[PDB]
């Protein structure tokens, strides 16, 4: 893998969240009911700026940190980032069990989002349609979407491990009397 620059990405994160919070505050000011002016965009906004900035900083910082600590790029980093973002969103409600639930559940949700590829889109060169499918032809290495009538036994033993029934030689041939 290639390391992430935490502080730079998180500074970009904070500026983006700040701009988004300003836009949401302006939208709230214009959509609202009561008497309002150019003063109220930050007085009467329900912590929108702090929501956006905190979520952005927390998510990007935690993601890049976990990617640099774990030394990997996978969906567990999105699980941690969701845990942190949920902790921020749940510290607003000044209650412990709601904070814990927010953390755990948005961690699980963003971790699912990362497990599935960290994308609302598709890869479109890893999809089943664009990838080699069906039965594999002549002793070739079975790819992900390919099908096989009969698999290699060394592969089974490595993927699964010896023990609990699964052995490098069948039992009957391995116990056959040398006659």
């Amino acid at each position: 893998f290639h390391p992430y620059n935490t502080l730079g990405l998180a500074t970009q994160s904070a500026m983006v969240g700040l701009g988004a919070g300003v836009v949401a505050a302006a939208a709230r000011n214009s959509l609202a009911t009561g008497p309002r002016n150019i003063l109220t965009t930050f007085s009467k906004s329900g912590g929108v700026v702090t929501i956006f900035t905190g979520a952005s900083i927390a998510y990007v910082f935690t993601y890049c940190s976990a990617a640099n600590l774990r030394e990997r790029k996978d969906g567990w980093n999105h699980m941690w980032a969701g845990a942190a973002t949920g902790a921020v969103l749940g510290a607003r409600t000044k209650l412990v069990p709601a904070f814990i639930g927010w953390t755990v559940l948005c961690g699980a949700a963003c971790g699912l989002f990362g497990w599935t590829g960290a994308r609302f889109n598709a890869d479109r060169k890893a999809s089943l349609e664009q990838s080699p499918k069906g039965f594999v032809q002549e002793d070739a290495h079975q790819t992900f979407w390919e099908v096989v009538h009969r698999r290699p036994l060394s592969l089974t033993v490595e993927q699964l491990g010896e023990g609990r029934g699964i052995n490098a030689v069948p039992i009957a041939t391995a116990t056959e009397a040398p006659n």
Binding site: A20, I51, Y59, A118
Partner: protein, 81 residues
């Protein structure tokens, strides 16, 4: 067990918590177009906000993806909390 796990947390991660979650989310979804005084200006503002927000989000994702994720999480929070 019977009261704190089987009739507690496993109903919270279950029929009770989902019910409360969806009550709050539904109420926030329908109390969004707040003012029935004028239906036209409000939805017009919604067109404007949608177009602006989409343009800035597409800018942000072209810059880098992972930065748009918490923005969308916060948008869902604003819409559904």
């Amino acid at each position: 067990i019977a009261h704190h796990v089987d009739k507690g947390s496993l109903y919270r991660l279950g029929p009770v918590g989902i019910n409360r979650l969806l009550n709050k989310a539904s109420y926030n979804v329908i109390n969004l177009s707040s003012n029935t005084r004028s239906s036209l200006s409000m939805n017009s503002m919604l067109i404007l906000i949608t177009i602006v927000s989409l343009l800035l989000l597409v800018l942000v994702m072209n810059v880098n993806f992972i930065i748009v994720i918490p923005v969308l999480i916060s948008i869902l929070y604003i819409l559904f909390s």
